[PDB]
Design an enzyme around this catalytic site. Structure first.
Site, short mmCIF file in Angstrom:
data_model
loop_
_atom_site.label_atom_id
_atom_site.label_comp_id
_atom_site.label_asym_id
_atom_site.label_seq_id
_atom_site.Cartn_x
_atom_site.Cartn_y
_atom_site.Cartn_z
N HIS B 120 0.85 -1.19 0.00
CA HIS B 120 0.00 0.00 0.00
C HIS B 120 0.89 1.25 0.00
CE1 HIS B 120 -3.92 1.96 1.44
NE2 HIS B 120 -3.03 2.90 1.71
N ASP B 197 3.11 -4.19 8.06
CA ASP B 197 1.85 -3.49 7.85
C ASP B 197 0.75 -4.54 7.99
OD1 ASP B 197 -0.46 -2.29 6.93
OD2 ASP B 197 0.44 -1.56 5.05
N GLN B 200 -4.58 -5.22 7.03
CA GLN B 200 -5.52 -6.17 6.45
C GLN B 200 -5.44 -7.55 7.10
OE1 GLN B 200 -7.27 -3.41 4.01
NE2 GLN B 200 -7.99 -5.49 4.53
N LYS B 223 -10.72 -0.36 10.13
CA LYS B 223 -10.86 -1.62 9.42
C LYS B 223 -11.13 -2.78 10.36
CE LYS B 223 -7.94 -0.16 5.63
NZ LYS B 223 -6.54 -0.15 5.11
N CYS B 361 -4.78 2.52 -3.80
CA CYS B 361 -3.58 3.02 -3.15
C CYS B 361 -2.41 2.05 -3.33
CB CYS B 361 -3.81 3.31 -1.66
SG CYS B 361 -5.15 4.45 -1.27
CL LIG Z 1 -3.46 7.11 -3.10
#
Ligand SMILES: [Cl-]
Ligand SMILES: [Cl-]
EC number: 2.8.1.7
Lengths: 403, 403
Positions: B120, B197, B200, B223, B361
């Site tokens: 991302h 990261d 998700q 999220k 993104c």
């Molecule tokens: Cl973006």
């Protein structure tokens, strides 16, 4: 006219009891209570309209709600353009954003920056880190005993190397309102920019950044009867579109390439990386509507009368030391005799009266007055003469008991 | 066992209608809907317990609620200590915090940093700005056609100058889960730190940062069925207590002096300047409780079955291109024939089906696949076989109509 009883009916926390007794919340300067209209506008958004911002319908409507709040905020402070407002976490993050994005490319070794001795830490520490990074000097406008700035010292502090004045609109401890318009004229005569810390101004009377001609202006939602985690940074369009990004990530880019580098998008949005705090933005917009519907001039009139009543009544408290000018806004900083503020505030809490005790994130201010701590009572639009009477009576009792 | 009907009853947005039709929200990867328990926990805090954090009672109870949420979050990801968790705005701000505080003092000219081609933008742009600031090189683990990392290239990318691997746990586009534990072993063999990261990952299955041995881990509340404006940055205690502050201001200082400089307080709190987003922190704690009460293993089982059903049903869609591996988590990235994703998503929105279209993104990911955009449907714990059927049917109709 203003009706404090109708206003208080909007604030569910005010019904609360603390320590078995009815709450008198006199700490709005640290954070303001919120009306149901603000609380429910945020809850209702989560309940019926929630999506990520920036094709499908919920997401398009949410994106439009957030840009409407940006517009409403820009009108609230009379900025020329909505695109002069950046959404930040609060005053503190806004100041850090300016200190890094604008400071790092405009303050060089041998330059100087001017702050005041009454500044909140939010408006000190980022300038100390900036000066340490670039090798500049942090200059300080000193205080008078009555809590006003020693404005006579400005000629010795401003020179051709002064890049920036960062100055509070209203002191969170003393309630002093600084003569911003004149100070900004003087600063601009030297090519210095002016950041105004307005965190204690925007809830007490109208604020007009075109009239002030400030270059940056910051305030926090949660002191404006709004949710936490949201605030506003205003920057003059001409400066803002020259400033480089600070935080990097999604939504602030135009293109991202792992071989040709990355380009940035246009101002405001260049300074808003990642998912915005849409819940907080929705609550902030409701907070601006609620305050505008009461009318800031009506709030100012009721708060000024309540303040005059409080200062008059507190004359009957033996050994009470007040700090700051007689025409203060919002807060009353005091110490009781020789008792430590922690003890005084603890007795007041025991009566169900919430005041703040300590250094109030203004340690240089405390040292100027040669005390370690102060008590502070805030008198906001939903506070009453009766709560003032409870504060006065409580201080009297604390004096008799501990004296 | 999991009961999707009982779960959906907690989510008031799911009753909504879009364009006259019942909403099928298949965009949880961009942001998740929130249950009433989360919405109301935040509203109730504003209604009955609101105050500024860090003597008087409401303020002391609010300070304790926020440190309890910090503890609950640390247990949720099995960190050793609550003091290894910093409250941030979200994944994006967490990564920027590490890139500046840790990056600026540990990545020097001639060093290199490794990311992947599926990252991302949140996990690309701060490393590009870091490399530009210090004169380091940004290296990239490339993709395989099936959406997995080309793990064979790691020996040519890792050397003695590799300071950091920053890598996604689960791709927000492809649903690939990366082999973090092995990659972290390899990275540590070279003295490189690893930022994960996890934005998700944390809603799909349990996450254990002691087992992963990652050095940094970040994710976003919104999220995780939680409010916006809040997220978590985990850092190993030994690294965190060596890191310098990033944002300056109140609450992160020990002492502030205008003549003797300023000292900082201890970790976590050194990295949390100004008023915390207590409203969001309260909602996040409720979100962790709600998810823990359902049980992440029960969520994982229901979501995996729903995913297998979806991938099976989508085989009956002519000219459907899928991107990523067969064992994806959470999201299905696709394009329909030669039609642009914007058009496909617009027809799906017109049926009341919310999917995201665009670059998500992840522009380098798009370029790897030589497309400008993709559609993405998320299959979260509150989505149903019936909503999958609506997506399949809608894609079929769009193919007939536009083909
Ligand atoms: Cl973006
Ligand atoms: Cl402080």
């Amino acid at each position: 006219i203003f009706s404090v009883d109708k206003v208080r009916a909007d604030f569910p926390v005010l019904s609360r009891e603390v320590n078995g007794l009815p709450l008198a919340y006199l700490d709005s300067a640290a954070s303001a209570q919120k009306p149901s209209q603000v609380i429910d506008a945020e809850a209702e958004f989560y309940r019926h309209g929630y999506a990520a911002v920036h094709i499908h319908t919920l997401s398009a409507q949410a994106t439009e709600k957030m840009e409407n709040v940006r517009k409403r905020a820009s009108l609230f402070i009379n900025a020329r353009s909505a695109e002069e407002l950046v959404f930040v976490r609060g005053t503190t993050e806004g100041i850090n954003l300016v200190a890094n994005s604008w400071g790092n490319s405009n303050v060089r070794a041998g330059d100087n920056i001017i702050i005041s001795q009454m500044e909140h830490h939010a408006n000190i520490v980022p300038w100390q880190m900036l000066c340490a990074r670039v090798g500049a000097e942090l200059r300080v406008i000193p205080l008078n005993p009555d809590g006003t700035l020693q404005l006579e010292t400005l000629p010795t502090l401003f020179d051709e190397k002064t890049r920036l004045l960062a100055i509070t609109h209203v002191s969170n401890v003393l309630g002093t309102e600084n003569p911003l318009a004149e100070m900004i004229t003087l600063a601009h005569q030297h090519g210095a920019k002016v950041l105004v810390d307005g965190a204690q101004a925007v809830m007490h009377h109208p604020v007009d950044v075109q009239a002030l001609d400030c270059d940056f202006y910051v305030f926090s939602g949660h002191k404006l009867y709004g949710p936490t985690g949201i605030g506003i940074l205003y920057v003059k369009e001409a400066l803002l579109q020259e400033m480089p990004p600070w935080e990097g990530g999604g939504s602030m880019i135009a293109t991202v390439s792992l071989s040709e580098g990355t380009t940035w998008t246009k101002a405001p949005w260049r300074f808003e990386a990642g998912t915005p705090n849409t819940g907080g933005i929705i609550g902030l917009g409701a907070a601006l509507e609620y305050v505008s519907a009461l009318g800031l001039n009506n709030i100012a009139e009721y708060e000024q009368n309540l303040m005059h009543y409080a200062l008059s009544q507190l004359e009957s408290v033996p050994d009470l030391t007040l700090y700051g000018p007689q025409n203060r806004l919002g807060v009353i900083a005091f110490n009781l005799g020789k008792h430590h503020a922690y003890d005084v505030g603890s007795f007041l809490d025991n009566y169900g009266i919430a005041v703040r005790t300590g250094h109030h994130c203004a340690m240089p201010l405390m040292a100027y007055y040669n005390v370690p701590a102060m008590c502070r009572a805030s008198l906001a639009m939903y506070n009453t003469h009766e709560e003032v009477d409870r504060l006065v009576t409580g201080l009297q009792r604390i004096h008799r008991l501990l004296g």
